């Protein structure tokens, strides 16, 4: 079955006075592949995809500040905080040019870095990614009341911080196949203490929905503007029925974005890595071999 373990040797690097954990495997020469997780996951989400890429390319998978095995400073965990820590992480590792593999909130981080540093990005593989949601009618109806609730300091904090709903409920609702107890426990591990759940609550409060927050909407519009014009090689994974990227939309996006190939993963919602890791990892490895890296 789909693997549940996390065998990777831990690595830590000091970034802005705090430690960030990261997976680092594969050959030391060549162009590295940087994997960026989102909410409420960690590098664990890449555990079954990296084994297809690591034979031929270095794979680096950080845990975002406040998540995974990374330290937990008392921040707001705004998107800007993740930007500062990820920018510093990339420079601390001395990375020059990279290929990005990104998902969901990791996709906003990755696209925003790539737009600012296009000479250092040799390709982007992405899935169930963040674009502006113009009105609440474009948010998936089955998750609309909950995300509206999450975006409050009363009910949203009760749900996400006190009751851990993002881990116990939203995470499984983003995977078609059933998650095992061992997998759930890996996802729960960084957040056993409620107070550490701050990033899980700030993230949905940052989503660019109905114009709000305006600073995030502007930033995401900007990287989308770039992505529709840039010749950067693109690999878009999508699933059925999907969540943010449904099949008919994925096909339209791939034909509109330059130098984009789209790959059907089969059944999927948001966390496509949990529904078909072997296809995602084997397609990434094949696509890397086509790049000038
Ligand atoms: C302990 N306690 C107080 C709760 C409360 C609620 C649940 C829910 C649940 C959750 C939602 C819920 O999250 N909607 C949102 C779904 O969004 C999925 C789509 O992806 C969004 C991606 C966004 C991407 C952004 C970056 Cl691109 C709604 C209502 C309830 C409910 O049952 O009231 C559970 C639901 C499932 C579940 N299992 C399958 C084991 C367990 C649950 O255990 C709860 C415990
Ligand atoms: Cl979120």
Swiss-Prot record:
One term under GO cellular component: membrane
Entry annotation: catalytic residues: 104 (nucleophile), 128 (proton donor), 270 (proton acceptor)
EC numbers for this chain: 3.8.1.5
Pfam families membership: Abhydrolase_1
Pathway this chain belongs to: Xenobiotic degradation; haloalkane degradation
InterPro entries in UniProt: AB_hydrolase_1, AB_hydrolase_fold, AB_hydrolase_sf, Epox_hydrolase-like, Haloalkane_dehalogenase_2
GO molecular function list: haloalkane dehalogenase activity
Catalytic activity: 1-haloalkane + H2O = a halide anion + a primary alcohol + H(+)
GO biological process, one term: response to toxic substance
Ranges where the AB hydrolase-1 domain occurs: 32-156
NCBIfam families to which the protein is assigned, alphabetical: PRK03592.1
Role noted for this protein: Catalyzes hydrolytic cleavage of carbon-halogen bonds in halogenated aliphatic compounds, leading to the formation of the corresponding primary alcohols, halide ions and protons.
Protein name as annotated: Haloalkane dehalogenase
Species for this entry: Rhodococcus sp
């Amino acid at each position: 079955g789909i693997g549940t373990g996390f065998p990777f040797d831990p690595h830590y690097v000091e970034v802005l006075g705090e430690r960030m954990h990261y997976v680092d495997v594969g050959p030391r020469d060549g162009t590295p592949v940087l994997f960026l997780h989102g909410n409420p996951t960690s590098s664990y989400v890449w555990r079954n995809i990296i084994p297809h890429v690591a034979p031929t390319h270095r794979c680096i998978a950080p845990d975002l500040i406040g998540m995974g095995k990374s330290d937990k400073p008392d921040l707001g965990y705004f998107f800007d905080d993740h930007v500062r820590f990820m920018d510093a992480f990339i420079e601390a590792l001395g990375l020059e040019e990279v290929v990005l593999v990104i998902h969901a909130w990791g996709s906003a981080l990755g696209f925003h870095w790539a737009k600012r540093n296009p000479e250092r990005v040799k390709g982007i593989a992405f899935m169930e990614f963040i674009r502006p949601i113009p009105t609440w009618d474009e948010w998936p109806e089955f998750a609309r009341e909950t995300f509206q609730a999450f975006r409050t300091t009363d009910v949203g904090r009760k749900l996400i911080i006190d009751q851990n709903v993002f881990i116990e409920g939203t995470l499984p609702m983003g995977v078609v196949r059933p998650l095992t107890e061992v997998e759930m426990d890996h996802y729960r591990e960084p957040f056993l203490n409620p107070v550490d759940r701050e990033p899980l609550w700030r993230f949905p409060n940052e989503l660019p929905i109905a114009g709000e927050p305006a600073n995030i909407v502007a930033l995401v519009e900007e990287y989308m503007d770039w992505l529709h014009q840039s010749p950067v090689p693109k690999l878009l994974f999508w699933g059925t029925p999907g969540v943010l990227i449904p099949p008919a939309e994925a096909a339209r996006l791939a034909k509109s974005l330059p130098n984009c190939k789209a790959v059907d993963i089969g059944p999927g919602l948001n966390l496509l890595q949990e529904d078909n890791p072997d296809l995602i990892g084997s397609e990434i490895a094949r696509w890397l071999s086509t790049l000038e890296i």
